[PDB]
Symmetry: C2
Subunit: 452 residues, 2 copies
Amino acid sequence: EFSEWFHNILEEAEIIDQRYPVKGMHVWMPHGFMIRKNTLKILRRILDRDHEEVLFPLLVPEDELAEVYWVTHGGLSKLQRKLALRPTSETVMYPMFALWVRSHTDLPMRFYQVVNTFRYETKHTRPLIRVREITTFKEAHTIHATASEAEEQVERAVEIYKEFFNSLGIPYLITRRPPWDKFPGSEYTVAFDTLMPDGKTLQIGTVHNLGQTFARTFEIKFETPEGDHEYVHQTCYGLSDRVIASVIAIHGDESGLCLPPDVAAHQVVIVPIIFKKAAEEVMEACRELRSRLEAAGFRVHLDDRDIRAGRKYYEWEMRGVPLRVEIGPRDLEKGAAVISRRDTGEKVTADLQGIEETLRELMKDILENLRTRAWERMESEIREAETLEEASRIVDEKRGIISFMWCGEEECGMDVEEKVRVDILGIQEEGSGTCINCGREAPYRAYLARTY
Amino acid sequence: EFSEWFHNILEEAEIIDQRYPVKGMHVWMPHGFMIRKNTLKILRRILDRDHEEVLFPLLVPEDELAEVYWVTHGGLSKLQRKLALRPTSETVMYPMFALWVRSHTDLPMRFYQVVNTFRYETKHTRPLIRVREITTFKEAHTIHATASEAEEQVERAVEIYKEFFNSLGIPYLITRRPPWDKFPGSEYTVAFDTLMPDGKTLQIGTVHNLGQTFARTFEIKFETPEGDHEYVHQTCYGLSDRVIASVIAIHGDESGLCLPPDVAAHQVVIVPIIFKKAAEEVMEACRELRSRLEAAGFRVHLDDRDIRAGRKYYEWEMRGVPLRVEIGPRDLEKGAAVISRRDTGEKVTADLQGIEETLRELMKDILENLRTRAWERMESEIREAETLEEASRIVDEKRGIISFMWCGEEECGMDVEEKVRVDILGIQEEGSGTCINCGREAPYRAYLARTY
Ligand SMILES: [Mg+2]
Ligand SMILES: [Mg+2]
Ligand SMILES: [Zn+2]
Ligand SMILES: [Zn+2]
């Protein structure tokens, strides 16, 4: 199944090593780390346009807070106010925000940090999808003057995760979580969901619109042009390692890892073909290619090693390198080489002259291609239902996502869950109809699925 | 004094905010973070030549270990094996290294990670120099086949910290810590020390040469060409935030922060001078300068704002920007502008044509200049002494570093410390003489000082 493929590739391409002396704490190995490093480069290059990165501490006071790991002793000495490994920054980024805000001249403000978080759980240990220590977790907070601009932010926020995701070539379904699932205290939480190969659903990003609710709890006032003092309007949002998890799974494959060009470890890998004849001329030619690519902004690599070229083909291919460039005596003379893709298999033949541009184009192609395929496979698993019994049938038989109309009342909604044993992703305001369950007027389009 | 200058600048240039609800945990603000981000870019660009970055977890088992914060409960449930916030990775990067090594074909190996560490202390809270949570701590570990190559690594390691430090323009004194200070279990630890403005000494980097000592404790064997199994030779080394601390202090100044060009937030800042006359032509000209610099690899900024230009001068100058470029009507016509330095004050006048190169040169200059000055001020605080009473006199009167000859026996050494109330930095094998204390033969050149 998928679950087996997944584990086996993590270990084979050396992404993470699970053999750590504690369940739920995993080690990033060289290759894995590299992919994560490039994934973050993309993310940060977007955020950094109008956001400011910072970095708060790891421990949070028992007091300020009012399944969380607790720090009690400082050796053998019991301390006098317990310290907790950060659940979510809420409790202490805020009190401080109180001190930074004191004039409508200050607002708006947009911060974010990439930190690690903790959650104490049992009976559920799934790699990169559910652990005890979430190594890569980006969270952004924003402060505003008017209740309107808050909502405008929520929109911008969304257009941001779209761009990010589009770059990883990942499909998504944007809805609006039900009030029993929204973020505690928030006005309303919005969610990004994507489909896994095992026909289940993964949450890969949320945007929350708090109110003045927290502003009040922690006292965050700002004096106005009219010389008064009102609380601020704020919003937060974040995404985790799951993003990395999905990029591996979604663009799966039988050969192994297949990755977007700006996420792979190396974009291009140059393999030389030699058999003792003209060896000296082939190499001296492979170099003039690497150094020419490096000094052009290319994450390039040259496999110097002494092994059966056929094997080199295997390794770099299971690992995820997009484009492979082969050089042989024959092609040498003419002044050209062979270029093998990864998403397809097609090996064309281009001239070593304007090769720099041929490669850039091929890269663009590969993404677009991988992206499309991706949406086709998802859209086709979104089926409609009009009778609760029609749902169960489909859920149990074709997994995937299930579309339907819903009244929107709580009870009605929760009973759908208990009968079908599913979770309601969220609404999407659209034309009327009649609820798939209680029959009354249904003013919303909703979704269901089995989730991670 | 220095201590006051320091705090006041941290707050004024918004580097870190100390007002956190716990003593010893501080918050990196936007500006501070930026400096740290660029400091790490330099560091990583060197390490990445022959090292491989990774990332282990934060918690370590009470068992595997055998003033450290302890995690006991998982809510209200007491756990069955306490978890400790990582003192040093030793205890769990190693057991894992055991599994990664199994053939002399595998060695050598060179890893490293940039993580956060913890230490529970009291009565000593000094910003960036001594805290509870060390946010930026780089640590590298290496595994080897022969006991010789281990030592070769120790040498390379050193030549690496030299290059790093030279880039920050920081002076250092390399010695070899005394056996009562070396790293527990190691054969011998080497140290890098630098002088603070308050005439005290700061440790800014160590290199340790463990042996087979740990290899044995954790079982790290590798099978040989001769088909046998011997333990490995390993070495570790690291540096922390102190590095950032020193760069601020060493290149101090009355105006404020003065920084190396590759460490400052912005390398260049363009200020436009306008008074309602030809305003439209001055701006349209300042832009053609920013976009021309950005697309040339320049961390540039344009102060659009509407405020008294004299103030702009103050802000960017207290913050640390190296070069300021001013544009006015007069200079506009001619086709040139004014460029003000930061280390000096000198404002030259160059032509807007080949300005790209004039700036690059000026940057090179500023570093070299700042570096030199730096060593002059340190070397001059290293005074010699021949009688214990001559030491005390100088230490108590001119602070600084004190040179002398030493026999090298422990007792003798420790008694020097207790009588003069100082710490012995380390030896430096050189010609003989007679010990400043016990009179016997002194085969080593040693150093003393009051430290942080
Ligand atoms: Mg639920
Ligand atoms: Mg001592
Ligand atoms: Zn209903
Ligand atoms: Zn002596």
